[PDB]
Write an enzyme that holds these catalytic residues in place. Structure first.
Site, short mmCIF file in Angstrom:
data_model
loop_
_atom_site.label_atom_id
_atom_site.label_comp_id
_atom_site.label_asym_id
_atom_site.label_seq_id
_atom_site.Cartn_x
_atom_site.Cartn_y
_atom_site.Cartn_z
N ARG A 228 0.88 -1.21 0.00
CA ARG A 228 0.00 0.00 0.00
C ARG A 228 0.89 1.23 0.00
O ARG A 228 2.10 1.13 0.29
CB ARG A 228 -0.82 0.08 1.28
N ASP B 135 -2.77 -1.07 8.91
CA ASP B 135 -1.77 -0.12 9.40
C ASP B 135 -1.09 -0.63 10.65
O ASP B 135 -1.54 -1.57 11.30
CB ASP B 135 -2.41 1.23 9.73
N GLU C 94 -3.64 14.18 6.03
CA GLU C 94 -2.64 14.00 4.95
C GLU C 94 -2.81 15.10 3.94
O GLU C 94 -3.92 15.62 3.72
CB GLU C 94 -2.85 12.67 4.21
N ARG D 279 -6.53 16.34 2.93
CA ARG D 279 -7.58 15.43 3.44
C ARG D 279 -8.26 16.02 4.70
O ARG D 279 -7.62 16.62 5.55
CB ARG D 279 -6.92 14.09 3.76
C1 LIG Z 1 0.37 6.02 10.09
C2 LIG Z 1 -0.96 5.55 9.53
O1 LIG Z 1 -1.75 4.88 10.26
N1 LIG Z 1 -1.23 5.86 8.23
C3 LIG Z 1 -2.44 5.44 7.55
C4 LIG Z 1 -3.46 6.56 7.60
C5 LIG Z 1 -3.90 6.93 9.02
O2 LIG Z 1 -4.39 5.75 9.70
C6 LIG Z 1 -5.04 7.99 9.03
O3 LIG Z 1 -4.62 9.14 8.28
C7 LIG Z 1 -5.24 8.38 10.48
O4 LIG Z 1 -6.32 9.37 10.60
O5 LIG Z 1 -4.65 6.20 6.91
C8 LIG Z 1 -4.56 5.30 5.85
C9 LIG Z 1 -5.84 5.12 5.17
O6 LIG Z 1 -5.95 4.28 4.30
O7 LIG Z 1 -6.80 5.94 5.46
C10 LIG Z 1 -3.39 4.79 5.37
C11 LIG Z 1 -2.11 5.18 6.08
O8 LIG Z 1 -1.06 4.20 5.92
#
Ligand SMILES: CC(=O)N[C@H]1[C@H]([C@H](O)[C@H](O)CO)OC(C(=O)O)=C[C@@H]1O
Ligand SMILES: [Ca+2]
Ligand SMILES: [Mg+2]
Ligand SMILES: [Mg+2]
Ligand SMILES: [Mg+2]
Ligand SMILES: [Mg+2]
Length: 448
Positions: A24, A49, A297, A313
């Site tokens: 991923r 995750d 993000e 986001r």
């Molecule tokens: C460090 C981590 O957990 N990253 C994950 C992120 C996060 O869980 C979310 O932004 C928390 O709010 O979300 C997702 C997701 O597919 O939505 C993938 C990322 O790999």
């Protein structure tokens, strides 16, 4: 249409590649020398995750514009379900150094249970990684040698990957669930670099001491890419999107940046700092206590005069955009909501494009154009000045003039790059955690 190019998807990462069952979180970048670098999480125990996994970072390279790719390499791997998760790529044009940054958690830790602070302590003006024994006594690592709380040297040493040696014999790793000395259970930002166009990579550097504040719980890379500023007073600055949680667990975006070719890093303010909500309330990222204003993000692009736009986001259902006049140190109080661009609470990719389109500077954007992770759509947004701010700075907006469905059905995280021929490469999650697809598109296709 005749001349349009959209290549049939190639599974650039897939179950079994490098003996990883799952993949991923794509990152995709074209270097100064024209090489394509693709990075990804090799998720070894399913798609979850951290902490419910053991995740390593994998890279593939193409030296022929994406037509063929190398056999791939794992570039960071910690033991016992300690994971590296969420990568980003950026190069310093001035030195030719390529950076890959990633979030790292010790075993048992991830976004939701990350502890407070950087995991470092200052002793006599230098920051040193802390380690804890089973009773909670605190030790520090000083030039890879472990010192106790009275500054007595112990028999323990470490290396950059967290291996723990007693009198030079490896006994465990400070990131494992079993070690007698463990790092604090929280997120760390790791940086590796390559000076040979991605062929070889450094040992990880833990930069938490430079960028993570005492009141942050999680601080992580926002995956995809960074930028190096091209125009204006901050030309040369390397900018890497991140996001963090405060003590209440609420998320705010920001960037980290370096003005010395990646040697030292600083975190800027969040767009949540002194943000004016629609109800007029002025919030900040340290005190944010509600879910609705969270910003997570993000990816960043530059306007013609150097101004930055941070695409985020968020929980509104639509794209949010922040503006910085000072190279990412601070942001204007208004976060714009663009209701022309659905945002289903998923990562997005946006990049500057090098050529004018219809006489305007342009960006290319990719995300799932839906209320769910589906209907993957690549857009060309043309930049127009629409006015000025009260402070006299130019005010820019995007005109999403061209919008092309590229992936029916599932579509989640993605990353764009411009290719040497002016076309666009895209690495996308067209499955939840299995095949990661690479395509090349031309503007004729995107406009058709
Ligand atoms: C460090 C981590 O957990 N990253 C994950 C992120 C996060 O869980 C979310 O932004 C928390 O709010 O979300 C997702 C997701 O597919 O939505 C993938 C990322 O790999
Ligand atoms: Ca591992
Ligand atoms: Mg191809
Ligand atoms: Mg182990
Ligand atoms: Mg065990
Ligand atoms: Mg502000």
């Amino acid at each position: 249409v005749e001349g349009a190019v959209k290549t049939e998807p190639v599974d650039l990462f897939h179950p079994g590649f490098l003996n990883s069952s799952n993949y991923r979180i794509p990152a995709l970048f074209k270097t100064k020398e024209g090489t394509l670098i693709a990075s990804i999480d090799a998720r070894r125990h399913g798609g979850a995750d951290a902490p419910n996994n053991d995740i390593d970072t994998a890279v593939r390279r193409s030296e022929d514009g994406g037509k063929t790719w190398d056999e791939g390499q794992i570039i960071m791997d910690y033991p016992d379900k300690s994971s590296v998760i969420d990568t980003t790529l950026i190069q310093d044009d001035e030195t030719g150094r390529i950076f890959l940054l990633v979030t790292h958690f010790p075993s048992k830790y991830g976004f939701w249970n990350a502890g407070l602070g950087s995991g470092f302590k200052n002793i006599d003006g230098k920051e040193y990684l802390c380690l804890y024994d089973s009773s909670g006594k605190e030790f520090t690592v000083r030039e890879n040698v472990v010192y106790d709380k009275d500054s007595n040297k112990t028999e323990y040493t470490t290396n950059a990957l967290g291996d723990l040696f007693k009198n030079g014999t490896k006994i465990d790793n400070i990131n494992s669930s079993t070690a007698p000395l463990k790092a604090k259970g929280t997120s760390y930002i790791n940086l590796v670099y390559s000076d040979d166009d991605g062929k070889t990579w450094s040992e990880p550097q833990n930069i938490n001491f430079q960028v993570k504040k005492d009141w942050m719980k999680f601080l992580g890379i926002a995956p995809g890419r960074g930028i190096q500023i091209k125009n204006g007073e901050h030309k040369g600055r390397i900018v890497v999107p991140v996001y963090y949680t405060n003590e209440k667990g609420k998320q705010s975006s920001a960037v980290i940046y370096s003005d010395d070719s990646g040697k030292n890093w600083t975190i800027g303010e969040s767009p949540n700092d002194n943000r004016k909500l629609e109800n007029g309330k002025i919030i900040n990222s340290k005190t944010l206590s509600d879910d609705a204003p969270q910003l997570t993000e993000c990816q960043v692009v530059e306007m013609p005069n150097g101004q930055l736009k941070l695409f985020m986001r968020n929980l509104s259902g639509y794209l949010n955009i922040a503006t910085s006049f000072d190279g990412g140190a601070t942001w204007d109080e208004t976060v714009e909501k663009d209701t022309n661009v659905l945002e289903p609470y998923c990562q997005l990719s946006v990049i500057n494009y090098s050529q004018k389109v219809d006489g305007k500077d342009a960006v290319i954007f990719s995300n799932p154009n839906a209320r769910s992770r589906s209907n993957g759509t690549v857009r060309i947004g043309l930049i127009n000045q629409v006015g000025t701010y009260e402070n006299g700075e130019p005010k820019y907006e995007f005109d999403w003039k061209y919008n092309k469905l590229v992936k029916p059905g599932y579509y989640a995280y993605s990353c764009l790059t411009e290719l040497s021929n002016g076309n666009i490469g895209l690495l996308y999650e067209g499955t939840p955690s299995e095949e990661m697809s690479y395509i090349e598109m031309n503007l004729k296709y995107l406009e058709s």
